[PDB]
Ligand SMILES: [Zn+2]
């Protein structure tokens with residue numbers, strides 16, 4: 001119906017919204033946007049590996065509370081290309097507000 | 101560009117409402133006014149006070165999280181300000197806007 005905005009559950013800093021949505025994965029309790037507020041988010045230095053060894057990602061932090069709230073996938077197999085270099089956030093670390 | 105904004109208390113970032121409940125706003129008071137806000141986002145203080153020009157009566161609005169005074173509810177007005185009355189009138193100096201992307 002009506003779009004949503006998304007915030008860190010700790011400090012409430014808005015990290016982006018529905019209109020940059022790409023896909024979600026209830027499997028991993030994640031969701032993925034194509035865009036996000038530059039200043040409210042930080043991609044960390046270290047490349048790290050999915051639990052199944054197959055992907056590489058950098059952690060995402062909220063620039064206000066420094067919680068790790070997501071990941072940016074840098075290396076993927078074919079089938080996870082839609083995620084790659086997108087902002088992939090953890091549902092448990094975020095809150096949605098819908099506009100009504 | 102036809103895209104909504106969302107509003108938050110500058111201090112804690114609690115969202116208090118959005119553009120879709122918009123009503124009117126006033127450049128000379130650096131304020132804006134909404135017909136709705138998030139249910140538990142906001143507290144009306146029980147003191148009743150007067151505009152600088154003696155004319156209206158408002159109670160202060162506080163952010164239930166950060167206790168900051170962020171606005172007011174005009175309880176009593178003349179005819180012309182009947183738009184404002186019993187509506188959430190926010191202080192632009194104390195709020196923040198986030199306009200969504202496309
Ligand atoms: Zn945060």
Ligand SMILES: [Zn+2]
Pocket residue numbers: 109110111112113114163164165166167168
């Ligand atoms: Zn606040």
